[PDB]
Amino acid sequence: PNQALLRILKETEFKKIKVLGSGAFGTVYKGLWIPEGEKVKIPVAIKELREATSPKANKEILDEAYVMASVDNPHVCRLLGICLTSTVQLITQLMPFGCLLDYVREHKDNIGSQYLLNWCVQIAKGMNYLEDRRLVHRDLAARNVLVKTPQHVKITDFGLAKLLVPIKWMALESILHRIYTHQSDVWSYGVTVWELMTFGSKPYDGIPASEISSILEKGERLPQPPICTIDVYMIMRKCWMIDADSRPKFRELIIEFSKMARDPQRYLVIQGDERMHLPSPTDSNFYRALMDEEDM
Amino acid sequence: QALLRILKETEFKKIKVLGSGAFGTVYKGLWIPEGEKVKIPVAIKELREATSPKANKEILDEAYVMASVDNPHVCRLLGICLTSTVQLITQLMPFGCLLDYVREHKDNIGSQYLLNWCVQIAKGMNYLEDRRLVHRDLAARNVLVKTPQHVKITDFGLAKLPIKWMALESILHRIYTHQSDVWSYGVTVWELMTFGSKPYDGIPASEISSILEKGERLPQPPICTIDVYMIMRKCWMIDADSRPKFRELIIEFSKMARDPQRYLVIQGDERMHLPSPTDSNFYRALMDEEDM
Ligand SMILES: Nc1ncnc2c1ncn2[C@@H]1O[C@H](COP(=O)(O)OP(=O)(O)NP(=O)(O)O)[C@@H](O)[C@H]1O
Numbered sequence: 001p002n003q004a005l006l007r008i009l010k011e012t013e014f015k016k017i018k019v020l021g022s023g024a025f026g027t028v029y030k031g032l033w034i035p036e037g038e039k040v041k042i043p044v045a046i047k048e049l050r051e052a053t054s055p056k057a058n059k060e061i062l063d064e065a066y067v068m069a070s071v072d073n074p075h076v077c078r079l080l081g082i083c084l085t086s087t088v089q090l091i092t093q094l095m096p097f098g099c100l101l102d103y104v105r106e107h108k109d110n111i112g113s114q115y116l117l118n119w120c121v122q123i124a125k126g127m128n129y130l131e132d133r134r135l136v137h138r139d140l141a142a143r144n145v146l147v148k149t150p151q152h153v154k155i156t157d158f159g160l161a162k163l164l165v166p167i168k169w170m171a172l173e174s175i176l177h178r179i180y181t182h183q184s185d186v187w188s189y190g191v192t193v194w195e196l197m198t199f200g201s202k203p204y205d206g207i208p209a210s211e212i213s214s215i216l217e218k219g220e221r222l223p224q225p226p227i228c229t230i231d232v233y234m235i236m237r238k239c240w241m242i243d244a245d246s247r248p249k250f251r252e253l254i255i256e257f258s259k260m261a262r263d264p265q266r267y268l269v270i271q272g273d274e275r276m277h278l279p280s281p282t283d284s285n286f287y288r289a290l291m292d293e294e295d296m
Numbered sequence: 297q298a299l300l301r302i303l304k305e306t307e308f309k310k311i312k313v314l315g316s317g318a319f320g321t322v323y324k325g326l327w328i329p330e331g332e333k334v335k336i337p338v339a340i341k342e343l344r345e346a347t348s349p350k351a352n353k354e355i356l357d358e359a360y361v362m363a364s365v366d367n368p369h370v371c372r373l374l375g376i377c378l379t380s381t382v383q384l385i386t387q388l389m390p391f392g393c394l395l396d397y398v399r400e401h402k403d404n405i406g407s408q409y410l411l412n413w414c415v416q417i418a419k420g421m422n423y424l425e426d427r428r429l430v431h432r433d434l435a436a437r438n439v440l441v442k443t444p445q446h447v448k449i450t451d452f453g454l455a456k457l458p459i460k461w462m463a464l465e466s467i468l469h470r471i472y473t474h475q476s477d478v479w480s481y482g483v484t485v486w487e488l489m490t491f492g493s494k495p496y497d498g499i500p501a502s503e504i505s506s507i508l509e510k511g512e513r514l515p516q517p518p519i520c521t522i523d524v525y526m527i528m529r530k531c532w533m534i535d536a537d538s539r540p541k542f543r544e545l546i547i548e549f550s551k552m553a554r555d556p557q558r559y560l561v562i563q564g565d566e567r568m569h570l571p572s573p574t575d576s577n578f579y580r581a582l583m584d585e586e587d588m
Pocket residue numbers: 020021022023024025026027028045047092093094095096097098099102139141143144146156157166
């Protein structure tokens with residue numbers, strides 16, 4: 001792993017200036033990195049991990065980080081820099097749009113089927129890249145897709161679970177036997193797609209994680225999203241098959257959700273979809289040049 | 297046409313006043329995507345002379361061209377807003393322009409850095425020559441820094457819509473060709489090698505065209521060997537067809553950047569900053585995702 005792809009930061013190089021949110025693994029501040037000997041202050045995203053439980057040695061952390069920093073894909077967020085102190089602080093590119101989950105919740109009325117189906121494509125491509133790299137995310141969820149632009153999404157918090165439980169997003173084998181494979185990540189992908197098709201609903205609402213394994217071991221799955229058709233749900237329902245090797249491979253999902261994007265009026269049904277905002281070329285280039293710029 | 301976004305004056309909102317010049321004024325702007333909760337830092341250019349609907353037609357037409365300059369080393373016109381007066385939207389560069397940068401880093405700036413900016417500025421200018429475009433307003437002030445290791449040329453085609461940088465023929469006959477930009481390039485390079493000095497300082501603009509014909513040229517920058525100043529001087533030939541072409545200055549500078557100590561003599565060059573691989577990937581990943 002290119003040991004130059006991860007830059008070691010001294011705590012004096014950057015500043016916390018805001019709290020964007022917290023999760024099971026740490027707190028994420030919006031940050032500013034002042035290049036040594038420069039008057040500019042560049043927007044970053046510091047995530048401070050919480051040690052528990054229980055802690056890795058400084059060297060082993062580096063090794064895992066050198067791997068998270070070696071992630072090169074248009075749809076997978078890469079670890080830019082790290083900071084070892086009394087705590088460990090990860091540094092990534094600041095995403096102003098926030099996570100995808102929050103995005104749809106904000107826009108439950110404005111999304112077109114073209115958008116949704118495309119995000120499933122981008123997430124799948126991203127997960128596929130990770131799969132091809134023999135890397136297991138472990139923690140895939142719609143909260144963990146950041147929106148770079150409304151038409152470009154990426155995946156964060158990769159391999160954090162390896163350093164340091166999202167029960168309602170885990171496949172059965174992960175819950176019961178701590179098994180984590182590219183196929184368990186597929187199940188999580190299914191839940192994520194569910195989250196998207198329901199404009200930010202909560203998986204198993206009211207049902208305590210305590211016994212999610214129970215309902216699952218009894219064949220209980222999530223409601224067929226209101227806007228989905230059978231073609232689509234057949235796929236989701238396939239991602240949640242107790243037999244792991246029965247679930248779709250990511251490369252196949254790319255093709256599946258791609259084929260569906262060819263005519264999104266067919267696989268998805270939405271209020272103003274007949275006339276809802278499709279990404280215009282002249283609009284997309286503006287977004288890309290000003291905010292994106294990365295090869296994809 | 298997809299390159300130029302006609303912005304509604306609502307979408308964007310000026311904020312800080314970054315500066316003013318010959319062609320207009322610059323503000324730190326904010327593009328607020330119509331349906332989004334995001335505020336995104338841009339760079340706004342309010343042309344200093346107002347404009348009417350007919351001049352607008354001619355303006356957009358150039359604006360499409362400016363929107364099409366797709367080069368890592370030349371700034372692209374992202375969006376435009378026709379109103380009482382025309383407004384242009386480009387990327388905002390926190391590092392500011394290359395001129396103010398050299399002056400506030402005289403002692404920090406080493407061989408490798410200077411000789412590289414030159415190469416880049418040549419690449420950008422060569423791109424404009426390859427596309428038969430005439431910059432007209434080249435100067436260290438027009439060359440923006442994206443990262444201390446990646447510079448870009450701005451205010452292209454703004455002239456079509458400065459004496460001390462202009463070529464002789466530009467001053468005496470308002471002629472602007474690629475070789476006349478090669479002249480402005482020479483002065484630009486000079487600006488840098490002198491860590492920001494003013495060209496022909498103490499000599500009134502109206503009397504600049506004069507001294508040129510008597511054979512007066514900017515002095516050899518204190519840090520320049522003859523391999524370099526020979527090139528700067530060749531850019532200032534009276535015969536336009538005699539000065540270097542941009543495709544050549546790229547080569548000749550690339551030659552020197554592969555052995556910086558020799559062609560540029562700077563005190564404390566031995567300790568001077570080397571752009572480490574990691575520190576670079578950090579800048580690129582964070583700021584310039586255009587593979588610098
Ligand atoms: N690069 C980023 N840019 C902008 N916001 C970010 C970025 N990374 C994380 N966030 C925000 O950080 C907030 C919460 O931090 P986080 O640690 O990701 O919790 P989480 O991912 O929702 N829960 P978890 O599954 O345990 O990681 C999320 O809502 C994200 O929107």
